[PDB]
Design a protein around this ligand. Structure first.
Ligand SMILES: Cc1c(NC(=O)CC(C)C)c(=O)n(-c2ccccc2)n1C
Ligand SMILES: Cc1c(NC(=O)CC(C)C)c(=O)n(-c2ccccc2)n1C
Lengths: 412, 412
């Protein structure tokens, strides 16, 4: 029926590094990217730390002139996208430009730009609003600007599914390729929600960790003293490519994208069901899509946000799907180190899943000092674990009960 | 080797009515839904009119308690979705709930809520932000809340592709069904961007008509005195359903969704290429997807925003795709009456395209007093035109050069 999809390029901005290799080095070393926020005064907020991108220079990617019209989340998405395309070695021509598209998403988009324009509006009226405000702030402009810069004329769209955005973006891009609508897609997500509205909005819901005294210990998935997620910024992008297309041009293949599953909890606007039933259906859908039995899974990059309800639901879901094999696989949350990159989480975590396959190493869950009741799987506590990994699964779950799972496999 | 997709239910809020029949009556009568905006003081703005939803009562759909947590764009999306599901007659059970999903999108989402929370933040600090601000404002919560209210556990996501949102949402939902990922999808879009940031943001770009003296004459697609688009609010939703599934339960079928095409211009962040080359590729992709020749198209619901560059580009694209047949088909812009519903435009216009098939009538382009250079097609100026319509095509184009086309056909 359908064509095979491989990963030929990757790119990233994260709290651990300004590219993929630097981020991954941090991941394998168990390094935290979390620190007190420097770019605003959070004296009035109950959370004053997060995962910032440190030392980003947009002028590596864009002229200063172009960059000034774009919200940070667009700058970040473009940086990761450009990295991924260069990493792939793909040359865009008239013969293929209609076959190359883009699906880069975001959970909340240009919140910083909105906040700044809203200050001008209230203080001075609508005349001080930027002419570039709309195109420089809306979520589909990563896809838009990337297509313009690289001459990409294929399917051009953007997902916004909260914390599931990056996973859905990659999965649906893979579908485009499998079904023949494109031969190449740049896919993933980006987020920069570290502004007053973001910190204040999540804080108002009491969803964020408030461990201001020890920011690097705040994100502690499955630990009994977890107290909410850590807000982080950045971007991940992957070049997905039809297999024969990749082979014909001698592309370096990182891994194969073999499965994509989706589900809805239909339970609650922000909380998962305690048994993770929706997450279970999603993982099973992804495995069925990949033609894999649960027992063939070696590594799970969990969603693992460090929220009370979320973390335990994901354990329940994994035990339901995997049975006894739940105790043979390794499962880790790299959010322990990166925090929660929101709409970018699924994108950077897809990249980490691919690199786990490349390097045959399960990244750690740092800060897992005291696993909570029932959190008795191999959660790769504290230190990276070299091991055999043929199949890696990556989960994302989001507000609205919206679930996504990707399955990657070593490529021969 | 894929399954057929039919439309079994429709729902709508528009500037012409609080449901589909009332809106369509206005469409066929050539009525304008455009008026001076009443819900805010626009004395400081250069545009003071738009297409408002008049007399909406959210309590027809939701308790007051539930509604106070939701931005207007979510309220509108849910109203259209609930209408569409009721219209379809579908009964959700344990046997089918995993096979029913939702794809309702938005271009800018909860701008009103953001603006109000930003006022509280600046005046009083972050402690005044609502706990419901994030889940009540993010774009994927139409899909989220609908799934929760109706118990829908199938694919759950949201597109955000500017003015193309509603078209992409419907097309990609159709793909889910065709490829067996779902048997039923509720799909479309909603928008409520009529706040200071919205009017101010589009005004700053000088994109809006400023014909404040005659609001009902402002939206005039292809007319030589057009001066930008008219901002409008509302929602459209369709129940898409696999054909055998519909037949088995005795569903009333409105029409068949036979084609979906996408492209990128890769040209400019807001302006289309003068020749509409991207729009041409998109329409051809949709026709190829449907297995139709251009000569089988009888009616085009144009994007037709009443912008200088946009309107003429779409004429060029139609002449390119259809050749001599461009002069045999009928093409109209219902934005002449409704204005531009942004992320909802493609959804309400898909509904209008389906009803054109049902009623064998091409809706008018009102206000087309003096067609501009080269606008010499049958643009259904002024008055509705009864005629044979077997195939109806609906276009949406958006910021970032992102294009979508849907093709519907009469169902036997
Ligand atoms: C905490 C959070 C989300 N939920 C999850 O991560 C799922 C888990 C805890 C069961 C989620 O979707 N968001 C979010 C991301 C982007 C925009 C809006 C909301 N957050 C913060
Ligand atoms: C005018 C406008 C857009 N562009 C078009 O309608 C296509 C153009 C060739 C006439 C568009 O995408 N938006 C928009 C919609 C939602 C959010 C952001 C932007 N507008 C206003």
């Amino acid at each position: 029926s359908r064509r095979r999809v491989v990963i030929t390029g990757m790119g990233m901005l994260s709290p651990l590094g300004l590219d993929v290799p630097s981020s991954w080095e941090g991941i394998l070393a168990g390094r935290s990217g979390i620190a007190p926020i420097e770019h605003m005064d959070l004296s009035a907020y109950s959370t004053r730390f997060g995962g910032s991108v440190k030392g980003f220079n947009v002028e590596e990617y864009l002229s200063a002139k172009e960059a000034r019209k774009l919200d940070l989340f667009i700058q970040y998405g473009l940086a990761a996208s450009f990295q991924a395309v260069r990493d792939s070695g793909l040359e865009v021509t008239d013969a293929n430009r209609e076959r190359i598209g883009v699906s880069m998403g975001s959970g909340i988009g240009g919140l910083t730009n909105i906040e700044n324009n809203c200050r001008s509006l209230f203080e001075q009226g609508p005349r001080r609003i930027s002419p570039f405000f709309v195109p420089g702030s809306i979520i589909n402009m990563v896809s838009g600007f990337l297509s313009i810069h690289l001459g990409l004329q294929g399917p051009n769209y953007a997902l916004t599914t909260a914390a599931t955005t990056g996973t859905h973006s990659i999965g649906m891009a893979a579908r485009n390729i499998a079904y023949g609508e494109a031969d190449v897609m740049v896919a993933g997500g980006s987020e920069m929600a570290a502004c007053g509205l973001g910190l204040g909005g999540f804080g108002a819901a009491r969803a964020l960790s408030t461990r201001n005294d020890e920011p690097t210990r705040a994100s502690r998935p499955w630990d009994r003293d977890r107290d909410g997620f850590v807000l982080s910024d950045g971007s991940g992008a992957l070049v997905l490519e039809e297999l024969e297309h990749a082979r014909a041009r001698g592309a370096r293949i990182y891994a194969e994208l073999v499965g994509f599953g989706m589900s809805g909890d239909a339970f609650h606007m922000t909380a998962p069901p305690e048994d993770g039933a929706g997450a279970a259906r999603c993982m099973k859908n992804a495995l069925r899509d990949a033609g894999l039995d649960p027992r063939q899974v070696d590594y799970i990059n969990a969603h693992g946000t460090s929220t009370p309800a979320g973390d335990i639901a994901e354990i329940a879901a994994v035990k339901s799907v995997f049975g006894e094999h739940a105790h043979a696989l390794s499962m880790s949350s790299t959010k322990s180190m990166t925090g929660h990159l929101l709409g970018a989480a699924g994108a950077v975590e897809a990249i980490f899943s691919v690199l786990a396959l490349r390097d045959q190493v399960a990244p750690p869950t740092i800060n897992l000092d005291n696993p909570d009741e029932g959190c008795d799987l191999d959660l790769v506590a504290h230190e990276a674990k070299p091991r055999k990994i043929d199949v890696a699964l990556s989960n994302s779950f989001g507000f609205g009960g919206t679930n996504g799972t990707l399955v990657f496999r070593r490529f021969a």
